[PDB]
Structure formats: C-alpha cells, structure tokens
Amino acid sequence: SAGAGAMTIVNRIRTDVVNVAKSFGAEYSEAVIDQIFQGFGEKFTNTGFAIRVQNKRNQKVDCNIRYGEAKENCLAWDIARESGLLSDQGHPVDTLIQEMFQAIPAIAYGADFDINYGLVKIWHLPKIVPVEEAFKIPSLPKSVNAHIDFFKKYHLDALCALTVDYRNKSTNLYFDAHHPEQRTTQFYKNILQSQQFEVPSDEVLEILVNCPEIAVTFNWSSPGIERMCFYTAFVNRETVPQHINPVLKKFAQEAPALLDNPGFLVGWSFGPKKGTYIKIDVDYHGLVVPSFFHMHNLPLP
Ligand SMILES: CC(C)=CCSP(=O)(O)OP(=O)(O)O
C-alpha cells in the first residue's frame, strides 16, 4: 500500500500524477515531485486542483499539476520560496507577482508546476477589472502597454487574471470573453491573423466561439505577442471533442480524478513556428469547472 489501497488523499494524488505522466510519456523528476508535494500537497487535497497534459510540436508531452484557492494574499509565494522552488533570476519576473498583488486587489491566487521542473507560474485573480489597471505594474513588459489599441479592437477590455511564468520569462493577461463578437468564428480568424498566427480548421473555430476566456502572452525579449490561447470547458469526459486530437481523446477517457464524473478545461494555443498546441486539464475534485463558469458570469451547462 505504498502507492495503493488505503491511503491519504495526498498520496492518491501523487500516484495518479505519476501514472498520468508515465501513460503519456511525459518526463518527470522524483526529486521535483517530492519537493512540490512537501510544500503544496495539502493545498492539492483541499482546493481546486487539476492535472494537465499538453502536446507541443516536436517534443514530449508535458505534465503539469496546478491549483487555485480564494485567498486574497499570494500564499504560494512564501511556500515556494521556503521549499526551494523559487529563486531569483535577476530579471523582471522576480518581483512581478508581488507587484501584481500590490497593484490590483486579488480575490484568489494559484500556482502551476511542471513535474519535470518545479514551480512554473503563479496566478493572480482579481474581480473583473478594466485592462488599464494592469498598466500600473512596474515590471510588465513594455509590449503590454504598446498593445492598448489591439486590446480595444478585439474587445479585450475585461481583465480576469494575470500570471507570471518564471521558467519561460513571460506573463499572460487573461480576459473575460464577454463580447458578442467573440461568439463568431470570424473574430478568431481575425485576432489570429492580426498576429500572423496559424488559423485552425473550421471545426476548431466552431468550438472556439464558446470560449469564455482568452489569454495573451507577452515577454521582455520581443515587442510582439508570443502566443495566445482560447479556453473552453467541457462538463464531462464524453463532451470533450475527443475526435479533434488523439491527446484529447486519450486524456478525456483516461485522466484520473477523485471525483467519479470530472469535467475538463481545454486551452487552444496558437503562435507564429511554435506556439500552436492543445492543453487539457482534468477537474480532479470537480471544483474547477464550476468556478470557471462562475468567474465568467455564465450559468453552468
Ligand atoms: C485555468 C485558467 C482558466 C487558465 C490557466 S493559465 P495557463 O496555465 O493555460 O497558461 P500557459 O499555458 O502557461 O500560458
């Protein structure tokens, strides 16, 4: 019953995470997993926890584990620092999450880990606010302010989250995709063409029109948008569009969850020639998907 039988919930989670990673061929480090769980295992037990796989072109599938909770302070930061998971790099990212919590009041936060690396991101979640609130933050890439007209044009006026990616040295702004233009396939063709990204098939465009949340990624090395991502949730295994991609099919059918009937969040990422791939998270305790609809003021499907 080392990894089986009667076990604490946190041990059930660890075993499930390693099983996913093995099944999808994702790399992982036992030392990094243990280090993450020493600090964060209790959080993973009691809050909105998810396991993600994603399939970047020409590399192995990555396996991430992440959680969020409705606390106004950035609790992950202290835990990660103490855990040896978050060292300064001599870079704008070092103070950015602190600046975000100073600049805009948070109603929740979360953290994201790649089990082959350690802590990748911390998220800041405010109540929905005008995007201009972000321009207060000292260490944001200069490219963010420079995209004021782009945000306005594409109805990216309602900021619903921020993140710092310590590994990638980038930041995402997340928008509530409330505008009726965002219910049309042309919107997605247009916003993707504005950046010279890849435009997906019609079948994928017809999925995107239901997206409640759009992320846009900025970095300090370039003036342009690195990639963007459209998030769509599915309330159970069967309603994931399993036919679109083999990773979607396999993960929907086989992802572990403690709750018998989990939903999923899928991120459709696009970039220039990387940046284009799919992310899928299983709602391991069943808390994430309802919270996702609620945070976007949408009835639960
Ligand atoms: C759960 C929400 C709605 C979005 C999470 S941000 P993300 O993990 O998709 O960000 P990246 O893939 O790191 O850009």
Swiss-Prot record:
Its EC number is 2.5.1.159. It holds the Pfam family PTase_Orf2. Activity is slightly increased in the presence of Mg(2+). Coiled coil: none annotated. The keyword Transferase applies. It catalyses: hapalindole G + dimethylallyl diphosphate = ambiguine A + diphosphate; hapalindole U + dimethylallyl diphosphate + H(+) = ambiguine H + diphosphate. Dimethylallyl diphosphate binds at residues 52, 66, 121, 172, 174, 227, 231, 279. Keywords: Prenyltransferase, Transferase. It comes from the Bacteria. One of its GO terms (molecular function) is prenyltransferase activity. Prenyltransferase involved in the biosynthesis of ambiguines, a family of hapalindole-type alkaloids. Catalyzes the reverse prenylation of hapalindole G or U at the C2 position with dimethylallyl diphosphate (DMAPP) to generate ambiguine A or H, respectively. In addition, accepts hapalindole A, an epimer of hapalindole G, and catalyzes normal prenylation at its C2 position. Hapalindole A and hapalindole U are fixed in the same hydrophobic binding pocket, but they adopt completely different orientations, which define reverse or normal prenylation. Belongs to the aromatic prenyltransferase family. This is Hapalindole dimethylallyltransferase. It comes from Fischerella ambigua (strain UTEX 1903).
